[PDB]
């Protein structure tokens, strides 16, 4: 059966370069056209490149014209996308497709390869406490995990002994290239005078661990 | 050359029927072939409809493609909608070495009653203020369907800078949650009487306010 497995990609810097790979198998590689489609996070699908089956005709939209170069190796059943002079906009998940030129549609899609392009480098988070506020009789407390890179961050509460009502929010991507997320817990408001709430933040990419105790005000 | 236009989000119920449209800006929708693709989060897209109204093997019979020249648009039709059909659908067409994709329509399969957002607003921590930084945290939870917009106000005036809001994310109980952050200088925070976070959900807004300690 048709298989399109993509490799390459990763984390880059503005103005740098990358070459993506798509290995093809399960069909006769030289018959079909090939294309690259990307989807930036929180965005729709966007067509990037299309090459003939012979490397004969090659179409590019204007957003990436002259920056990307699509190629193919018949001997190795491989489709390539050379991305040069990368930008923060080009951060997306890149999909490799087999085309059927006769019908104007992509009948098979790859697994996808993620490309990140940012001017950040590894950084541990600054963890601050989110002192409680109401929800009365039910209160909400947490701790803010600010300005880290890259993902992921893991948070547990009271070393995992506290799980009831724990909700760790997905991180936002800041315009500074750094991540921020929050982990909040909801608890009976009565227990604030007696219970100790400590959030254990773990950021393995920078090997940083932070424990912050959340007190009332 | 042209632009394929789809609605942003449509929602239906189980077993019911929905029609997803893909109008074409200029020219005739019947000039070139139309293609439909289903997309799940963290998942590779699969082709659902090719050559205007052909479905590949394995695609369920519920899915069907059509063309309506009266509106110069195409339609993807889903009968007897399932929970698994909650996804994103993209129409596609080709013309003169260009592959035109639509904006996509996020199909919501309404499997529970509508829920109003729970909104909690945190001021900057005292510790953060001493580090010469200040962040407001607006946590939005327990709403369905999962699409909200957030607006921040300083005193009573709209804030046009420093706002970062997450895309809504599906919670454990199949409801959705999102979060919003406002970055300030400590002097900004202390200078205003209050800051407020407004969450609009199904055209009805919930609002919470905090003020410097």
Concise synopsis of the structure shown:
By secondary structure, chain A is mainly beta. Chain A has strands at residues 3-7, 10-12, 18-25, 33-39, 45-51, 58-59, 68-73, 78-83, 92-100, 105-109, 113-117, 126-134, 138-148, 154-157, 166-168, 172-173, 179-188, 198-203, 208-213. Chain A contains no helices and 19 strands.
Secondary structure tally: strands of chain A:
19
Q: How do the helices and strands follow one another from N- to C-terminus of chain A? A: EEEEEEEEEEEEEEEEEEE
Structural class designation of chain B: mainly beta
For this entry, what is the oligomeric state of its chains? heterodimer
Choose one word for the global shape of chain A: elongated
Gap from first CA to last CA of chain A? 63 Å
Q: What is the CATH architecture assignment of the largest domain in chain B?
A: Sandwich
Q: Got a strand count of chain B? A: 19
How large is the share of residues in beta strands of chain B? over 45%
- Our estimate of the beta-strand percent of chain A is over 45%
Tell me the structural class of chain A: mainly beta
Radius of gyration of chain B: 22 Å
PDB class: immune system
Keywords: malaria, transmission-blocking, antibody, immune system
Assembly: dimeric
Entry title: Crystal structure of malaria transmission-blocking antibody 85RF45.1
Question: How would you describe this structure to a colleague?
Answer:
The PDB classes it as immune system. The entry lists the keywords malaria, antibody, immune system. The assembly is dimeric. Crystal structure of malaria transmission-blocking antibody 85RF45.1. Chain A: 85RF45.1 Fab heavy chain. Organism of A: Rattus norvegicus. The complex is a heterodimer of chains A (217) and B (213). By secondary structure, chain A is mainly β. Chain A folds into 2 domains: 1-119, no CATH class; 120-216, Immunoglobulin-like (Sandwich), CATH 2.60.40. In chain A, 0% of the residues lie in helices and 53% in strands. Chain A is built from no helices and 19 strands. In chain A, strands 2, 4, 5, 6, 9, 10 and 11 form a 7-stranded mixed sheet that branches. In chain A, strands 12, 13, 15, 16 and 17 form a 5-stranded antiparallel sheet that branches. In chain A, a hairpin with a 4-residue loop joins strand 9 and strand 10. The termini of chain A are far apart. In chain B, the strands form 4 sheets. In chain B, strands 2, 4, 5, 8, 9 and 10 form a 6-stranded mixed sheet that branches. In chain B, strands 11, 12, 15, 16 and 17 form a 5-stranded antiparallel sheet that branches. Chain B has helices at 126-130, 186-191, and strands at residues 4-5, 9-12, 18-24, 34-39, 46-49, 63-68, 73-78, 88-94, 99-101, 105-109, 118-122, 134-143, 148-154, 157-158, 163-165, 169-170, 176-184, 195-201, 204-210. The radius of gyration of chain B is 22 Å and the shape is elongated. The relative contact order of chain B is 0.16. In chain B, a hairpin with a 2-residue loop joins strand 18 (195-201) and strand 19. By secondary structure, chain B is mainly beta. Chain B has 2 domains: 1-111, Immunoglobulins (Immunoglobulin-like); 112-212, Sandwich (Immunoglobulin-like). Helix content of chain B is 5%, strand content 48%. At the A-B interface, strand 4, strand 5, strand 10, strand 12 and strand 13 of A face strand 4, strand 8, strand 9, strand 11 and helix 1 of B.
